[PDB]
Each structure stands twice: as C-alpha cells, then as structure tokens.
Amino acid sequence: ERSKSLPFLMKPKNLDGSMAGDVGFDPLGLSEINDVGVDLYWLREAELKHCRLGMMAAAGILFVEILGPAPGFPAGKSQMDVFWKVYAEKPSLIGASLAAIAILEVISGVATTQGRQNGDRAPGDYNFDPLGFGKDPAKFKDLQLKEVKNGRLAMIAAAGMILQGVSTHQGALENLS
Amino acid sequence: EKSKAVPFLPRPAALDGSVVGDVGFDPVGFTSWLPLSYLQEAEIKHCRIAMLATLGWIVADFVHLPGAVHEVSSLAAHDVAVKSGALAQILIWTSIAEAISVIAISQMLEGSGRQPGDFKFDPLNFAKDEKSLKKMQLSELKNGRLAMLAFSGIVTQAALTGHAFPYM
Ligand code: CLA
Ligand SMILES: C/C(C=C=C1C(C)(C)C[C@H](O)C[C@@]1(C)O)=C/C=C/C(C)=C/C=C/C=C(C)/C=C/C=C(/C=C/[C@@]12O[C@]1(C)C[C@@H](O)CC2(C)C)CO
Ligand SMILES: CC(/C=C/C=C(C)/C=C/[C@@]12O[C@]1(C)C[C@@H](O)CC2(C)C)=C\C=C\C=C(C)\C=C\C=C(C)\C=C\[C@@]12O[C@]1(C)C[C@@H](O)CC2(C)C
C-alpha cells in the first residue's frame, strides 16, 4: 500500500509494477493526470524520449571534450559555445539536422497518439532493434531497466552540463577540475 | 495494422496492397480525406515533371542551344527564357495538356476506369503483360521520387552557391 521509494507515501494508483524503473516515486501524483492529452502513456513516452536525448547529449559532450572534435570541426571545449562556431561556418548542417529532427518528431507524436488510441504499442517503442539485442524476454526487462536508469542519470547530467556551459562558459571536465 | 514502411505506425487504412509503390507510407493520413486516385495522379505528374526538370537542368548546364539567349546557367535561365518568350510556348502547350488532363482526371474520378497517370502513351511497348507493367510502374515511381528529391537538392544548392553542374 505504501510506495517502495517513499515509505511515508501511499502507492501511486497508476504505477503498479509494470514500467521499468518503477519504485513508486510519484509524490505529486502526476501519474494520475488524464487531461490535455496527458496520461501515464504520454508521460512515459516523454520520459523515455528525455532519457534517450539526455544519453545522446551527455555522450556527445563527453566524447567531444575528451577525444576532441572530428576533423574539420571547431574546437574550444565549451560545448554550449562551440555550437555557434559550427553554425557560423556550417549552417546547412544545423538546418538539415533540425529539419530531420522535426520530421522524426512529428512521426513520433503521431505514433504516440495512435498507440495510445488503439493500444498495441508500448510507450517509447519504435521497433528499433536492428542488431537484435532485445529479441528474447527475460533480457528485455533488464535492458529496459538499464536504459531507464542510464537515461535518468544522463538527463540529470545533460541538464547540469547545459547549465554549466551557459553560466561558466567553460568545459564540463574543465568545471570538474 | 503496422504499416510496412513505419513499423510502429498503423496501416494508413486506405493503402492495403493494391497500388504500385505502396509501402504503407502515410503517417499524416493524407489518404484519409483525399481520393487515392487523385493523390496517385498528382504524385505521378510530379514524378514525370521533376524527372524532365532534373535532366534538363543538368543537360542545359552542359549543352546550350545555338544563340546568345541560351548562354546562361540554368539558375538564371528562368528570367532569360521568360523574357525571350521561350517559356511562353511551354506554358501554352502545357496548359493544353493540362486541360485535357482536367477532363481525364474528372472522368477517372467519376468512373471510367483510367488508372491514375495512365495516358496510354506507349509508342514502343516496354510493357507487354501485367507483371511487366507493374514492374515498370514501380520503376517509374521510384525514379520519379528520386528525381523530385534530386531536383530539390540541385536547385537549393545552386541557389545557395552559384556553382556549375557540381553543386557542392
Ligand atoms: C521541365 C521541363 C523543362 C523545362 C521547363 C525547360 C526549360 C528550359 N530549357 Mg530545357 N531541357 C529539358 C527540360 C526542360 N527544359 C530536358 C528534359 C532536356 C534534355 C533534352 C533539356 C535540354 C535543354 C538544353 C540543351 C537547353 C535547354 C534550355 C532551356 C531554357 C530555354 C529554352 C527551352 O525551353 O528549352 C529548349 C529545350 C530543348 C531544346 C529540349 C527539350 C526536350 C524535351 C523537354 C523532351 C521532350 C518532352 C516532350 C516534348 C513533352 C511534351 C509536352 C506536352 C505538353 C506536349 C528553359 C529555361 C536552353 C537554355 O537556355 O539553357 C540554359 C538550352 O540550351 N534545355
Ligand atoms: C504541436 C506540436 C507537435 C505535435 C503534435 C502533432 C503533430 C499534432 C501530432 C500528434 O498527434 C500530437 C502532437 C502534439 O504530438 C508541437 C511542437 C513542439 C515544439 C513546440 C517544439 C519545441 C522544441 C524546442 C527545443 C527542443 C529547443 C531546444 C533548445 C536548445 C538550445 C540549445 C543551445 O545551443 C543553443 C541553441 C545556444 C547555446 O548557446 C546553448 C543552448 C541554449 C544549450 C537545446 O536543444
Ligand atoms: C531538408 C534538407 C536540408 C535542409 C536544410 C536547411 C533547411 C538549412 C537551411 C540553412 O542553412 C541554410 C540553407 C542557410 C542558413 O543561413 C539558414 C539555415 C536555415 C541554417 C535536406 C533534405 C535532404 C533529403 C534527402 C537527402 C533525401 C534523400 C531521399 C532518398 C535517397 C529517397 C529514396 C527513396 O525515394 C526513393 C529513391 C524510392 C522510394 O520508394 C523509397 C525512398 C528510399 C524513400
């Protein structure tokens, strides 16, 4: 009856055990929202998209700062400020990436709403397993848990890197030391 | 359910299997409120127009017709051809063809039996049975889509950088 994460709180009604990373940590009861097209399905899809985006962004920042930029690309070690140097010399790359992300996000929203309507697609599912790393069950749950935990950690990390780069105008590991 | 192209999206519910080049790609559901034959005709018309346009752009940046008016790049050829009246002739004959097309598409939508884009233009055969016709329709659709995207890229690159045939 009590949430596993917060023993002083009752179990959130909509979070039983199903989703990976579920420990009952919903103090504000946001999982019970059923308005403005927002429900547990939409919240989970948003959480998974945030997890994946944060993982990609943190990996990119760390890669560029440690191993350096790719040939022909600007340096500076400040990832929040090197973006304007890339846009100053290769605006077409940024524009094409933005257009591609826009199209993919329109497709993602359509897929989310459709799967919410005629329930056949789990939240965050895009059938993207080209290498077959999660075919069999009893490993899919473990992979989902790993992805969720890594994505939450990378969300926090990427938000921290964004704020550090905006404020200190220095590199992430530069702030570290 | 679970359209072939986008495996996580539902089938567009208007494209089951009985159209050439039908991989179930309609995420925004254009076929849900527009006739399928109308959209097919529009797509095939775009394919043919853009194939001709890509070939003409690339060729005219290499070979020029005799005369001083034809000595401009394809990027600047529009303002020269419109002034000389060269594009007026193309406009006149294209308008005639498109009025006949108005009649044809109206008849196709109101029964008839004319397949979308089927003008029966076939001096040579190149398509003897149903299988050959289907294969060549798929080839035409794929080549037309590729040429539409290719002309888009060619024009955008040439406008961005006023370069010759290599528009990099
Ligand atoms: C979308 C189709 C299209 C359009 C609008 C244009 C437009 C133009 N072309 Mg052009 N061209 C095209 C296709 C096209 N071309 C193709 C496919 C080729 C390859 C043979 C060429 C080869 C070409 C050359 C070599 C030159 C031009 C030039 C020009 C410019 C002025 C003279 C002229 O009209 O061309 C004259 C066109 C030709 C001599 C060949 C056209 C052959 C046609 C397109 C193929 C048969 C299709 C058939 C007749 C369709 C019937 C239509 C129906 C309604 C009845 C003008 C901007 C001239 C210029 O100023 O260059 C900058 C020039 O020197 N074009
Ligand atoms: C209606 C809609 C879409 C939809 C739909 C459909 C289509 C109807 C389908 C469904 O049926 C429903 C629904 C709702 O899904 C809404 C669209 C979404 C919006 C409104 C898009 C918002 C995106 C904004 C982002 C993601 C911007 C991020 C900015 C960053 C800046 C980066 C910086 O580097 C910059 C530039 C400068 C640097 O110095 C430092 C920083 C600041 C870090 C980080 O990235
Ligand atoms: C949109 C795009 C790029 C957009 C870039 C933009 C907006 C950037 C704009 C800017 O930089 C400028 C210009 C100047 C700056 O000052 C301002 C900004 C704004 C910064 C590229 C698309 C590029 C699109 C591309 C490359 C498409 C390739 C498509 C292929 C290969 C298709 C293949 C098929 O069609 C066939 C062949 C057969 C079919 O049946 C099957 C498939 C597979 C679908």
Coordinates of C-alpha atoms and ligand atoms in Angstrom, one line a residue:
Chain A
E1 CA 0.0 0.0 0.0
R2 CA 3.0 2.3 0.6
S3 CA 5.3 3.3 -2.2
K4 CA 8.6 1.4 -2.2
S5 CA 10.7 4.5 -2.7
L6 CA 8.8 6.8 -0.3
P7 CA 7.6 4.7 2.7
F8 CA 5.7 7.7 4.1
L9 CA 3.5 7.9 0.9
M10 CA 0.8 5.6 -0.3
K11 CA 1.4 3.6 -3.5
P12 CA 0.6 5.7 -6.6
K13 CA -2.5 4.2 -8.1
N14 CA -1.5 4.2 -11.8
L15 CA 2.1 2.8 -11.1
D16 CA 1.7 -0.8 -10.1
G17 CA 4.9 -2.5 -11.1
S18 CA 4.9 -2.7 -14.9
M19 CA 7.2 0.0 -16.2
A20 CA 10.9 -0.4 -15.8
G21 CA 12.4 1.7 -13.0
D22 CA 9.1 1.8 -11.1
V23 CA 9.8 2.4 -7.4
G24 CA 6.6 4.4 -6.7
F25 CA 8.4 7.7 -6.7
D26 CA 5.4 9.9 -7.6
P27 CA 5.0 12.2 -4.6
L28 CA 2.9 14.8 -6.6
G29 CA 0.7 12.1 -8.2
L30 CA 1.4 13.2 -11.7
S31 CA 0.7 9.7 -13.0
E32 CA -3.0 10.3 -12.3
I33 CA -3.2 13.2 -14.8
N34 CA -5.8 12.4 -17.5
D35 CA -6.2 15.7 -19.2
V36 CA -4.8 17.9 -22.0
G37 CA -3.9 14.7 -23.8
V38 CA -1.5 13.8 -21.0
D39 CA -1.7 10.5 -19.2
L40 CA 0.6 7.8 -18.0
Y41 CA 1.3 6.7 -21.6
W42 CA 2.2 10.2 -22.6
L43 CA 4.3 10.8 -19.5
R44 CA 6.2 7.6 -20.0
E45 CA 6.8 8.4 -23.7
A46 CA 8.1 11.8 -22.7
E47 CA 10.3 10.3 -20.0
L48 CA 11.8 7.8 -22.5
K49 CA 12.4 10.4 -25.1
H50 CA 14.1 12.6 -22.5
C51 CA 16.2 9.6 -21.3
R52 CA 17.4 8.9 -24.9
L53 CA 18.0 12.6 -25.7
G54 CA 20.0 13.1 -22.5
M55 CA 22.0 9.9 -23.1
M56 CA 22.9 11.1 -26.6
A57 CA 23.7 14.6 -25.4
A58 CA 25.9 13.6 -22.5
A59 CA 27.7 11.0 -24.6
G60 CA 28.3 13.7 -27.3
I61 CA 29.6 16.3 -24.8
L62 CA 31.9 13.8 -23.1
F63 CA 33.2 12.4 -26.5
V64 CA 33.9 15.8 -28.0
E65 CA 35.6 17.1 -24.8
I66 CA 37.7 14.0 -24.2
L67 CA 38.7 12.8 -27.7
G68 CA 38.4 16.2 -29.4
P69 CA 36.3 17.2 -32.3
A70 CA 36.1 15.5 -35.7
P71 CA 38.4 16.8 -38.4
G72 CA 37.3 20.0 -40.0
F73 CA 35.1 20.9 -37.0
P74 CA 35.8 23.8 -34.5
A75 CA 37.3 23.3 -31.1
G76 CA 37.1 25.2 -27.8
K77 CA 36.0 22.6 -25.2
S78 CA 32.9 24.7 -24.4
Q79 CA 30.1 22.6 -26.0
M80 CA 27.4 25.3 -25.3
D81 CA 29.5 27.9 -27.2
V82 CA 31.1 25.7 -29.9
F83 CA 27.6 25.3 -31.4
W84 CA 27.6 28.9 -32.6
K85 CA 31.0 28.3 -34.1
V86 CA 29.6 25.4 -36.1
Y87 CA 26.6 27.4 -37.1
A88 CA 28.8 30.3 -38.2
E89 CA 30.6 28.1 -40.7
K90 CA 28.2 25.1 -41.4
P91 CA 24.7 26.5 -41.0
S92 CA 23.3 24.0 -43.6
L93 CA 24.3 21.1 -41.3
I94 CA 22.4 22.6 -38.4
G95 CA 19.4 23.3 -40.6
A96 CA 19.3 19.9 -42.1
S97 CA 19.6 18.3 -38.7
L98 CA 16.8 20.5 -37.3
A99 CA 14.5 19.6 -40.3
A100 CA 15.2 15.9 -39.9
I101 CA 14.6 16.0 -36.1
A102 CA 11.3 18.0 -36.8
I103 CA 10.1 15.3 -39.2
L104 CA 11.1 12.5 -36.9
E105 CA 9.3 14.2 -34.0
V106 CA 6.1 14.7 -36.0
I107 CA 6.2 11.0 -36.7
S108 CA 7.0 10.3 -33.1
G109 CA 4.0 12.3 -31.9
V110 CA 1.7 10.7 -34.4
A111 CA 2.9 7.2 -33.3
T112 CA 2.5 8.1 -29.7
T113 CA -1.1 9.3 -30.1
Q114 CA -2.0 6.3 -32.3
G115 CA -0.5 3.7 -30.0
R116 CA -2.3 5.4 -27.1
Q117 CA -5.6 5.2 -29.0
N118 CA -5.6 1.6 -30.3
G119 CA -3.4 0.1 -27.7
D120 CA -0.8 -2.1 -29.5
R121 CA 2.5 -0.2 -28.9
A122 CA 4.2 0.2 -25.6
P123 CA 5.3 3.8 -24.7
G124 CA 8.7 4.6 -26.2
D125 CA 8.5 1.7 -28.6
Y126 CA 9.7 2.4 -32.2
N127 CA 10.6 -1.2 -33.3
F128 CA 14.3 -0.1 -33.5
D129 CA 16.3 -3.3 -32.8
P130 CA 18.5 -3.7 -35.9
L131 CA 21.1 -5.7 -34.1
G132 CA 18.6 -7.9 -32.2
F133 CA 19.9 -7.1 -28.7
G134 CA 16.5 -7.4 -27.1
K135 CA 14.7 -10.2 -29.0
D136 CA 14.1 -12.7 -26.2
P137 CA 12.3 -11.8 -23.0
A138 CA 13.9 -12.0 -19.5
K139 CA 16.6 -9.9 -21.1
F140 CA 14.2 -7.2 -22.4
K141 CA 13.1 -6.3 -18.9
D142 CA 16.7 -6.0 -17.8
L143 CA 17.6 -3.9 -20.8
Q144 CA 14.6 -1.6 -20.2
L145 CA 15.7 -1.1 -16.6
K146 CA 19.2 -0.4 -17.6
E147 CA 18.0 2.1 -20.3
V148 CA 15.7 3.9 -17.9
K149 CA 18.3 4.2 -15.1
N150 CA 21.0 5.4 -17.5
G151 CA 18.6 7.8 -19.2
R152 CA 17.6 9.4 -15.9
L153 CA 21.2 9.8 -14.9
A154 CA 22.1 11.2 -18.3
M155 CA 19.1 13.5 -18.1
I156 CA 20.4 15.0 -14.9
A157 CA 23.9 15.1 -16.3
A158 CA 22.9 16.8 -19.5
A159 CA 20.9 19.4 -17.7
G160 CA 23.9 20.1 -15.5
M161 CA 26.2 20.3 -18.5
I162 CA 23.8 22.8 -20.2
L163 CA 23.6 25.0 -17.2
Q164 CA 27.4 24.8 -16.5
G165 CA 28.2 25.8 -20.1
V166 CA 25.7 28.6 -20.2
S167 CA 26.9 30.1 -16.8
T168 CA 30.6 29.4 -16.5
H169 CA 31.2 29.3 -20.3
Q170 CA 33.7 26.5 -19.8
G171 CA 34.0 22.8 -20.5
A172 CA 32.4 20.1 -18.4
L173 CA 35.6 18.5 -17.2
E174 CA 37.0 22.0 -17.1
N175 CA 34.4 22.7 -14.4
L176 CA 35.2 19.3 -12.9
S177 CA 38.9 20.3 -12.1
Chain B
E1 CA -2.1 -2.8 -39.0
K2 CA 1.6 -2.0 -38.5
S3 CA 2.4 -0.5 -42.0
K4 CA 5.4 -1.8 -43.8
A5 CA 7.3 1.5 -44.0
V6 CA 6.9 2.8 -40.5
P7 CA 6.6 -0.5 -38.5
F8 CA 5.4 1.3 -35.3
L9 CA 2.6 3.2 -37.1
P10 CA -0.7 1.7 -38.0
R11 CA -1.5 1.0 -41.6
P12 CA -3.0 4.1 -43.3
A13 CA -6.2 2.2 -43.7
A14 CA -6.5 3.4 -47.3
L15 CA -3.5 1.6 -48.8
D16 CA -3.9 -2.1 -48.3
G17 CA -1.8 -3.6 -51.1
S18 CA -3.4 -2.9 -54.4
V19 CA -1.3 0.1 -55.6
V20 CA 2.1 0.1 -57.2
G21 CA 4.7 1.6 -54.9
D22 CA 2.5 1.0 -51.8
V23 CA 4.7 0.5 -48.7
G24 CA 2.0 2.0 -46.4
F25 CA 3.7 5.4 -46.1
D26 CA 1.1 8.0 -45.0
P27 CA 1.9 9.0 -41.4
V28 CA -0.2 12.2 -41.5
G29 CA -3.0 10.4 -43.2
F30 CA -3.4 12.4 -46.4
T31 CA -5.3 9.5 -47.9
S32 CA -7.9 9.7 -45.1
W33 CA -9.6 12.8 -46.5
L34 CA -8.4 12.9 -50.2
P35 CA -9.2 10.4 -53.0
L36 CA -6.4 7.9 -53.6
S37 CA -6.6 8.2 -57.4
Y38 CA -6.2 12.0 -57.1
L39 CA -3.1 11.7 -55.0
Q40 CA -1.7 9.0 -57.2
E41 CA -2.2 11.2 -60.3
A42 CA -0.6 14.1 -58.5
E43 CA 2.4 12.0 -57.5
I44 CA 3.0 10.6 -60.9
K45 CA 2.6 14.0 -62.5
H46 CA 5.2 15.4 -60.1
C47 CA 7.5 12.4 -60.8
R48 CA 7.4 12.9 -64.6
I49 CA 7.8 16.7 -64.4
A50 CA 10.7 16.6 -62.0
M51 CA 12.5 13.8 -64.0
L52 CA 12.3 16.0 -67.1
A53 CA 13.3 19.0 -65.0
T54 CA 16.4 17.4 -63.4
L55 CA 17.5 16.0 -66.8
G56 CA 17.0 19.4 -68.4
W57 CA 18.8 21.4 -65.6
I58 CA 21.8 19.1 -65.7
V59 CA 22.0 18.9 -69.5
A60 CA 21.5 22.7 -70.1
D61 CA 24.3 23.4 -67.7
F62 CA 26.4 21.5 -70.1
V63 CA 24.9 21.8 -73.6
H64 CA 23.4 25.1 -74.9
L65 CA 21.2 25.7 -77.9
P66 CA 22.7 28.0 -80.6
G67 CA 22.1 31.6 -79.8
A68 CA 23.1 34.3 -77.3
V69 CA 19.9 33.9 -75.3
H70 CA 20.8 30.3 -74.5
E71 CA 24.2 31.2 -72.9
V72 CA 23.1 31.4 -69.3
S73 CA 23.2 29.0 -66.4
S74 CA 20.0 27.0 -65.6
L75 CA 19.7 29.0 -62.3
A76 CA 19.5 32.3 -64.3
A77 CA 17.8 30.7 -67.3
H78 CA 14.2 31.3 -66.0
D79 CA 14.4 35.1 -66.2
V80 CA 16.0 35.0 -69.6
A81 CA 13.6 32.4 -71.1
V82 CA 10.6 34.2 -69.8
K83 CA 11.7 37.4 -71.4
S84 CA 12.5 35.8 -74.7
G85 CA 9.1 34.0 -74.7
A86 CA 10.7 30.6 -74.7
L87 CA 8.8 29.6 -71.5
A88 CA 5.6 31.0 -73.0
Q89 CA 5.4 28.2 -75.6
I90 CA 6.0 25.6 -72.9
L91 CA 3.3 27.3 -70.9
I92 CA 0.8 27.2 -73.8
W93 CA 1.3 23.6 -74.7
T94 CA 1.5 22.5 -71.0
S95 CA -1.8 24.3 -70.5
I96 CA -3.4 22.5 -73.4
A97 CA -2.2 19.2 -72.0
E98 CA -3.4 20.1 -68.5
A99 CA -6.9 21.0 -69.7
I100 CA -7.1 17.6 -71.4
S101 CA -5.8 16.3 -68.0
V102 CA -8.6 18.1 -66.3
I103 CA -11.0 16.2 -68.4
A104 CA -9.1 12.9 -67.9
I105 CA -8.9 13.2 -64.1
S106 CA -12.6 14.2 -63.9
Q107 CA -13.6 11.1 -65.9
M108 CA -11.3 8.9 -63.8
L109 CA -12.8 10.2 -60.6
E110 CA -16.3 9.8 -61.9
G111 CA -15.9 6.2 -63.0
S112 CA -14.3 5.5 -66.4
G113 CA -11.6 3.1 -65.4
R114 CA -8.5 5.0 -66.4
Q115 CA -5.7 4.2 -63.9
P116 CA -4.0 7.3 -62.3
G117 CA -1.3 8.6 -64.6
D118 CA -2.3 6.2 -67.4
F119 CA -2.5 8.3 -70.6
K120 CA -2.0 5.1 -72.7
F121 CA 1.1 6.8 -74.2
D122 CA 3.2 3.8 -75.3
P123 CA 4.6 4.0 -78.9
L124 CA 7.1 1.3 -78.1
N125 CA 5.8 -1.5 -75.8
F126 CA 8.2 -1.8 -72.9
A127 CA 5.3 -3.4 -71.0
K128 CA 3.6 -6.5 -72.6
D129 CA 1.8 -8.1 -69.7
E130 CA 0.6 -7.2 -66.2
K131 CA 3.8 -8.2 -64.5
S132 CA 6.0 -6.0 -66.8
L133 CA 3.6 -3.1 -66.4
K134 CA 3.7 -3.4 -62.6
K135 CA 7.5 -3.6 -62.5
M136 CA 7.8 -0.6 -64.8
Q137 CA 5.3 1.4 -62.8
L138 CA 7.3 0.7 -59.7
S139 CA 10.5 1.8 -61.5
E140 CA 8.8 5.0 -62.8
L141 CA 7.5 5.8 -59.3
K142 CA 10.9 5.2 -57.6
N143 CA 12.9 7.1 -60.3
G144 CA 10.4 10.0 -60.1
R145 CA 10.6 10.3 -56.3
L146 CA 14.4 10.2 -56.6
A147 CA 14.3 12.8 -59.3
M148 CA 12.0 15.1 -57.3
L149 CA 14.4 15.0 -54.3
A150 CA 17.3 15.4 -56.7
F151 CA 15.9 18.5 -58.4
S152 CA 15.1 19.9 -54.9
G153 CA 18.7 19.4 -53.8
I154 CA 20.1 20.7 -57.1
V155 CA 18.0 23.9 -57.0
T156 CA 18.7 24.6 -53.3
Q157 CA 22.4 24.0 -53.7
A158 CA 22.7 26.1 -56.9
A159 CA 20.8 29.0 -55.3
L160 CA 22.9 28.7 -52.2
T161 CA 26.2 28.5 -54.1
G162 CA 26.2 29.7 -57.7
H163 CA 28.3 26.8 -58.9
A164 CA 28.3 24.8 -62.2
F165 CA 27.0 21.2 -62.5
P166 CA 28.7 20.0 -59.3
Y167 CA 26.5 22.0 -57.0
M168 CA 28.6 21.0 -53.9
Ligands
CLA1 C1 10.6 20.5 -67.0 C2 11.0 20.6 -68.3 C3 11.8 21.6 -68.8 C4 11.7 23.0 -68.8 C5 10.7 23.8 -68.1 C6 12.9 23.5 -69.5 C7 13.2 24.9 -69.7 C8 14.2 25.4 -70.4 N1 15.2 24.8 -71.0 MG1 15.4 22.7 -71.1 N2 15.6 20.6 -71.2 C9 14.7 19.7 -70.6 C10 13.5 20.0 -69.9 C11 13.1 21.3 -69.6 N3 13.7 22.5 -70.0 C12 15.2 18.3 -70.9 C13 14.5 17.1 -70.5 C14 16.3 18.5 -71.7 C15 17.2 17.4 -72.2 C16 17.0 17.1 -73.7 C17 16.6 19.9 -71.8 C18 17.7 20.4 -72.6 C19 17.9 21.8 -72.7 C20 19.0 22.4 -73.5 C21 20.1 21.7 -74.2 C22 18.8 23.8 -73.4 C23 17.6 24.0 -72.5 C24 17.2 25.3 -72.4 C25 16.1 25.7 -71.6 C26 15.6 27.1 -71.4 C27 15.2 27.9 -72.7 C28 14.9 27.0 -73.9 C29 13.9 25.9 -73.6 O1 12.7 25.9 -73.2 O2 14.5 24.6 -73.8 C30 14.6 24.1 -75.1 C31 14.5 22.6 -74.8 C32 15.1 21.7 -75.6 C33 15.8 22.0 -76.9 C34 15.0 20.2 -75.3 C35 13.7 19.9 -74.6 C36 13.3 18.4 -74.8 C37 12.0 18.0 -74.2 C38 12.0 18.5 -72.7 C39 11.9 16.5 -74.1 C40 10.6 16.0 -74.8 C41 9.4 16.3 -73.9 C42 8.1 16.5 -74.6 C43 8.3 17.5 -75.7 C44 7.0 16.8 -73.7 C45 5.7 17.3 -74.5 C46 5.0 18.4 -73.7 C47 3.5 18.3 -73.9 C48 2.8 19.3 -73.1 C49 3.1 18.4 -75.3 C50 14.4 26.9 -70.5 C51 14.6 27.6 -69.1 C52 18.2 26.2 -73.1 C53 18.9 27.2 -72.2 O3 18.7 28.4 -72.3 O4 19.7 26.7 -71.3 C54 20.0 27.5 -70.2 C55 19.3 25.1 -73.7 O5 20.3 25.5 -74.3 N4 17.1 22.8 -72.1
LIG2 C1 2.0 20.7 -31.9 C2 3.4 20.2 -31.8 C3 3.6 18.9 -32.4 C4 2.6 18.0 -32.4 C5 1.7 17.0 -32.5 C6 1.1 16.6 -33.8 C7 2.0 17.0 -35.0 C8 -0.3 17.3 -33.9 C9 0.9 15.1 -33.8 C10 0.3 14.5 -32.5 O1 -1.0 13.9 -32.8 C11 0.1 15.5 -31.4 C12 1.3 16.3 -31.2 C13 1.1 17.3 -30.0 O2 2.4 15.4 -30.8 C14 4.3 20.9 -31.1 C15 5.7 21.0 -31.4 C16 6.7 21.1 -30.5 C17 7.5 22.2 -30.2 C18 6.9 23.5 -29.8 C19 8.9 22.2 -30.4 C20 9.9 22.6 -29.5 C21 11.2 22.4 -29.4 C22 12.2 23.2 -28.8 C23 13.5 22.7 -28.4 C24 13.8 21.3 -28.2 C25 14.6 23.6 -28.3 C26 15.7 23.5 -27.5 C27 16.8 24.4 -27.4 C28 18.1 24.1 -27.1 C29 19.1 25.1 -27.2 C30 20.4 24.9 -27.4 C31 21.5 25.8 -27.2 O3 22.6 25.6 -28.1 C32 21.8 26.8 -28.2 C33 21.0 26.9 -29.4 C34 22.5 28.1 -27.8 C35 23.7 27.7 -26.9 O4 24.5 28.8 -26.5 C36 23.2 26.9 -25.6 C37 21.9 26.2 -25.7 C38 20.8 27.1 -25.1 C39 22.0 24.9 -24.9 C40 18.6 22.7 -26.7 O5 18.2 21.8 -27.7
LIG3 C1 15.7 19.2 -45.8 C2 17.2 19.2 -46.0 C3 18.0 20.3 -45.6 C4 17.5 21.4 -45.0 C5 18.5 22.4 -44.6 C6 18.1 23.6 -44.2 C7 16.6 23.9 -44.0 C8 19.1 24.6 -43.8 C9 18.9 25.9 -44.0 C10 20.0 26.9 -43.6 O1 21.4 26.5 -43.9 C11 20.8 27.4 -44.8 C12 20.2 26.9 -46.2 C13 21.3 28.9 -44.7 C14 21.4 29.4 -43.3 O2 21.8 30.7 -43.3 C15 20.0 29.3 -42.8 C16 19.7 27.8 -42.5 C17 18.3 27.7 -42.1 C18 20.6 27.4 -41.3 C19 17.7 18.1 -46.7 C20 16.9 17.0 -47.1 C21 17.5 16.0 -47.8 C22 16.8 14.9 -48.3 C23 17.4 13.8 -48.8 C24 18.9 13.8 -49.0 C25 16.5 12.7 -49.3 C26 17.0 11.6 -49.9 C27 16.0 10.7 -50.3 C28 16.2 9.5 -50.8 C29 17.6 8.9 -51.0 C30 15.0 8.7 -51.2 C31 14.9 7.4 -51.6 C32 13.5 6.9 -51.9 O3 12.7 7.7 -52.8 C33 13.3 6.5 -53.3 C34 14.6 6.7 -54.2 C35 12.4 5.4 -53.6 C36 11.3 5.4 -52.6 O4 10.2 4.5 -53.0 C37 11.9 5.0 -51.3 C38 12.9 6.0 -50.8 C39 14.0 5.3 -50.0 C40 12.2 6.9 -49.8

